[PDB]
């Protein structure tokens, strides 16, 4: 038993009732909700593995009874469970650091806090003690608390083949532990077992192509990054930039003339998007309807590749004539228009008259467009609050929802064809739907279970709280085919540094 | 003594840990979940109006302790909370039925029962010892227990004031009540409180529209049933009928034509729809692609009004010539194939040939249809278990999610005339989602509150476990407004048979 | 018990000084400050009633007392006083919520907290201990306190009786309240009772028309909604949208003519006003002088009405020949442009030659005009910070200080002629210059009584810290009157939502 | 580093100034112009030319058009803030400029480095920098 | 509605074990007949085996991993039997049409988990 810092026992004077806990939670130690981390040969030095806010939340049975309290105090008794080996080498510091101190990112100024050294060799099972750091007779809710952060002080290496060194926390409240105030359990702490509801992915619907089911769970090696507007979700503020919460609904658009043709292609037409929640043209606010396509077609493109859509011409109650027409974002000419999520677009046919107004239903792809360019979304430019570009850890690639466009052939003069295309979407507001509903451990990364075949074959992917999953992957493929009829099911919290020991082989 | 029925304090002697409780949830008093019903002289005489089986769930605070906990031990001490007044001439009888005795259902026999009587026109509660009845050491999940049950020992007779009379029931555990064997908090049983996530309902998708958003909540006196296949949703065995938790995924389905026609018309070249999910064509599965359209018709009325969707040849990797056609179900003599919610449908155009796919995207409704031919979906007469008819209570209306259909007008002879119409839903998947993931206690109804204007205007609704919600209304009307900009709100669990205080006046 | 949380004493060993209380402070009862509200079978179901925070501020001793010391400790008991009858059926709950713990919008989530429940047909007062939930020794000020919510336990359905249920709070300090560290008995916190200086109506000036004395309070029920730059006062932000505490002194303008008329005649000279206080014509600065004239005339009004002012050539030292001219804001044509209040205007005169400043000063409307057409001020656009468009709340009706605009009648040909108007002011700053001294208790509204003839009548309105009264009325008037030889007496403080007793009956 | 500046040239001209050309400067760091951020580039010139004295005084800068890969025929310039007459944008620190010559065409990219003031300017008039209004 | 018995599949990784028998054809040379040709009969289990496991029965719920004892000994092939009437064994490879000597016998081992691997792979590759 190690204390870096002395525990205060808080003597609870002021507290209006002193609600004492179950005497059995206090003997019996628990896994950390979060505490899991993995340390590789690739971990580099000094970096943070496990933030953890001295708190409730350490214990899964005090995280549970902390719904129901306003208020509570001390410490808890932390156990390390290090599955160390024999041939592997290496230090962990793991430091107190008092409320109201930023971290910082050195384990140089790191050891200035009060703090431990963990060797690997002789780590497992040891005791930390969490001090309870405050000025004040107990916690409220919302108070800035004390942090335990757990940083590579030395870099895992072995004298043999390599191995990850998995360690995982477990806790116990300590006997000063108390809880204050009794009050309805609906309170702000995230619940600290999420329960998924069961439900297949092919169930879900598909944000960048809700006409279209998702059949599969699609992994490229290629796909380092995404720039999507829609189906983009986090825990915290719900559907962020373009996305929203029903993507049939707010499919459709209507954009107006503008008495412009195009310079080169006088067969383009232009038109601009009108913007029911913008119509005051705010610059802060997007400048695209809520929930529309942001399929990408390309750079300079246009002779080769658009997109393809219903038009029709809005007469009194419905729609006149509507008919797949080709159309793209932007000009061809400048960048900033040209493969740009904004509000001018342009419709290839000739009958665009003045000041119409013309509905626009996004179907697919024309000419050689691709996956890939349809994978990459135009670039969003201004203040507006738009969804940033995303990438997963080094060695974790993307899980996508992918879905099926079929292609649209016409015989005639009237309308355009398409060409079939694969859609890709990072998250079906479906499954984020029960995850914010329960709240994400501060920091933390879902692990969940994608139960295949009824349980002989299970996948493990990182679901992150700003609205992406990851899966450890080995090699490298084009194209990964994951079946849509399992269900994900809830593992534990981890660390975003922790890396799944289930690793998916690409190159089959 | 307000305690007909002693308590027998368990030594809890098998217990293989005896855990205590906070002791301030014995000393402060919680609001029974599901303890909320009303009388009046509407009452059918010897009806039960609560049976409450003693449990951990009687008490808020005991009931999240209980999620922890794999047993327990020890009664409860509720109050009753009668809202009448002088003018509520009647008796109230609240009596303890032991386990494995069959409720009776008149109050003189009940009084054999230990019980206690209490007036409608006392403003004090009244508190009555809930002992836990058992023969053994303590109960598991699962057992016989004792039932609280309340019945009207004499009935309302003042004919003056026939106001509804809102009971509430309030718990706290006896001071023997104790807890065994900790366990991790995840349990099946119901959350005592339910969150819905705030989403307006604009922001929810309509099962029976898709494409088309929810801007309306809609009352009509005139509809009072509903036969449904989409938009049915059960909180207990899920989605039910046809329909689907991605309405939009599911909406497009493939026919094929055989060499056929109507008897009347040889314009209208009969499709046999294809089961992607039944194969195998068995009576006890569904006739039709899962989640597709079920709008009404009417009967015989193909030669008046059809639905209008988009066909087209299926090519290699896509669809050919996809324009809107005219189809309806069935032919247009025979029962039940017309207004018959089955496999074999036509299509309007000579262009079917034989034995070929065609895609099928229902957007349509055109000739005479209007809203009410459209509300009464086709007839179900399969084996197959398809979604009943049902009915709100007397004195209550179904609120519906309303959505506008936009017409497909055309100019040219190549495609069909549409006409603008309204589609309603019995229930989004949106909301019964949030719902899954916390559950209903059993034989309970979720009383809702919908805030409009930021609180100013607060409309009360009862969302029932089979999937529909109601409100109480007076006089008629024939398309009552909602708007749906707000957002819904749990109030709290309800009997089936409990009367809203809030009334929407239909005659506005 | 009637403490659901008991009292935590805190032992003041951090506190400098304790100083105690007179020990009959403790002993005897004392309304709340603002602890007034009502409740009817309209209440919003979930609304809360009325949120206190436990502080000194809850008795009007210890308030008086808080103003001499630095720090605080201690709660206190409440009483509630229900003016019901045995026809008021319903439930109320007042609960105890602690500190950073967010107020739920259910009673059955109420129930979880710390709470006791009232029933309306009690004609005794209901005890509720507020114990003070603290973590520190003692109390600063703007600290988080513990609140006191009343909420609606059971809704009232007895719709027999549908009157409005005045409930008070009366209050009294526990015996364990305690002062610190003796200060100056100056603060910024509002006083609990505010002494207007009982000047009568008369006595205070006309924002809107300074020149004419009040004559008059006005009911209108046509009326609904006031959008003026004048006679705006609000409690916190001063003087708002362009009105003056010197309504006189700022009444007289400059403007300064160009070449140029109006396109449909050329005797309307264009005029720009003049901007003393913004000379940089910044768009966030009001467009006009301040306490300028702001009545209406009208859309397109110009061929038919206008307005009426002394205006003249600026000579040195002086101003030439001032004469009754006509005027109007804007033009007659554009918008925002005619009816907007902006700097550009014209006057009805070909004497303004180029360049020159002339005196304005606004006395008269004249034509087609009329009560309502000065009634509706011109419309504002900008982005400087004009008074918003405030409306009554439903079933109240605003009550304005009235003054009767003698005609300016003219035989000769030299100058114009004007017609009698009445003219409406939403607030005299004489009224709210006491209220300044004192300031209003955050989110409460003054209930003020205006007694007429000795005290034989007295009328009560809510003085709205926005800066306008209101008084309930039944049935419409077109002008109802009301003395204003009467004084202004201070009854207490109410919710912005509080139904006054007195009703004024328009229909005589 | 941020003194330079680049400028977009439109048509029309001061009235009765055809040669005081209209030009609009660029803003990188407010590429959709929100009225929350400033409608100039960072560390732009804020030299006074005074309240409306286009006839009197001006600034000089070094104008260039960027023809490829970098500007050519770079002169000193002659140009000013707002358009003259209206105090709205004239004498203000707003997007819009003037740069007088009668050679400079639309819509192309100009290089603007303020280097001094030619006509009647004094200590006093560049000393007071133009409003600032938004 | 009739209770018929369901379709069922081995837990992936392992194939069905069927009881195969020859059945001759009926060949016919005048115009009375129908001609028959050769073919193979596959059942998933044998009455009377199940008959035995009856007297016993099975735990619940357990499968019960049974021995195929080849001509006194080794080879020894490994099976599992479940409650629902079918047996399995561990493969590796495609092969079909893979063979096994029925002259062997059954003899019990343990009880097992539905999800238990057997030891012994059968290589399907001959």
Chains 1, 2, 3 share one sequence.
Not at 26 to 39: A, H, K, R, S, W
Not at 192 to 220: C, D, F, G, H, K
Not at 398 to 412: C, D, E, G, I
């Amino acid at each position: 038993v190690t204390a870096p810092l002395p525990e205060a026992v808080s003597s609870l004077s002021l507290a209006p009732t002193v609600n004492a806990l179950d005497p059995w939670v206090y003997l019996n130690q628990t896994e950390v909700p979060g505490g899991t981390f993995t340390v590789s040969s690739a971990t580099q030095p000094g970096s943070v593995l496990l933030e953890l806010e001295i708190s409730p939340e350490l214990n899964l049975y005090t995280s549970h009874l902390f719904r129901m309290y306003a208020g509570w105090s001390g410490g808890f008794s932390l156990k390390l469970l290090v599955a160390g080996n024999a041939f592997s080498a290496g230090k962990l510091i793991a430091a107190i650091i008092p409320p109201n101190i930023e971290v910082p990112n050195s384990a140089y100024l790191l050891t200035g806090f009060p703090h431990e050294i963990l060797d690997f060799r002789t780590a497992d099972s040891m005791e930390i003690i969490a001090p309870d750091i405050k000025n004040i007779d107990y916690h409220f809710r919302g108070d800035k608390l004390g942090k335990l952060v757990v940083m590579v002080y030395s870099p895992l290496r072995s004298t043999s083949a390599d191995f990850e060194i998995e360690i995982k926390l477990t806790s116990a409240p300590l006997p000063d532990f108390k809880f204050t105030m009794l009050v309805p359990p609906i309170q702000n702490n995230a619940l600290p077992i999420w329960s998924i509801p069961q439900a297949p992915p092919y169930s879900m619907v598909n944000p960048r192509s809700p006409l279209t089911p998702v059949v599969e769970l699609y992994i490229n090696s290629s796909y380092a990054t995404c720039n999507h507007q829609l189906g983009r979700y986090t825990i915290y503020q719900g559907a962020i930039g373009n996305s929203t919460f029903n993507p049939s609904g707010a499919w459709t658009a209507t954009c107006t003339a503008e008495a412009g043709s195009v310079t080169g292609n006088p067969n383009w037409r232009y038109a601009l998007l009108d913007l029911p929640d913008n119509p005051t043209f705010d610059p802060t606010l997007p400048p695209v309807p809520r929930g529309f396509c942001d399929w990408g077609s390309g750079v300079k493109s246009g002779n080769k590749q658009h997109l393809v859509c219903f038009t029709g011409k809005k007469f009194a109650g419905g729609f006149q004539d509507v008919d797949a027409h080709m159309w793209d974002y932007g000009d061809n000419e400048t960048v900033g228009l040209d493969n740009t999520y904004q509000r001018t677009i342009y419709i290839s046919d000739p009958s665009l008259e003045k000041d119409a107004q013309y509905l626009v239903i996004p179907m697919g792809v024309s000419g050689a467009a691709n996956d890939d360019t349809v994978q990459v979304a135009p670039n969003c430019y201004g203040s507006w609050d738009y969804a940033p570009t995303v990438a997963p850890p080094l060695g974790e690639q993307f899980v996508w929802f992918r879905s099926q466009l079929p292609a649209s052939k016409t015989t005639t003069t009237s309308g355009v064809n398409s060409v079939p295309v694969n859609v890709n979407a990072l998250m079906s507001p479906d499954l984020i739907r029960s995850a914010y509903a329960s709240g994400f451990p501060l920091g933390k990364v879902a692990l969940l279970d994608y139960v295949l075949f009824g349980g002989s074959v299970v996948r493990q992917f990182k679901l992150y709280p700003e609205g992406y999953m990851t899966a450890n992957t080995t090699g490298s493929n084009t194209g990964f085919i994951i079946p849509a009829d399992g269900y994900f099911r809830f593992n534990s919290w981890v660390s975003p540094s922790f890396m799944i020991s289930s690793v998916v082989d690409l190159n089959l």
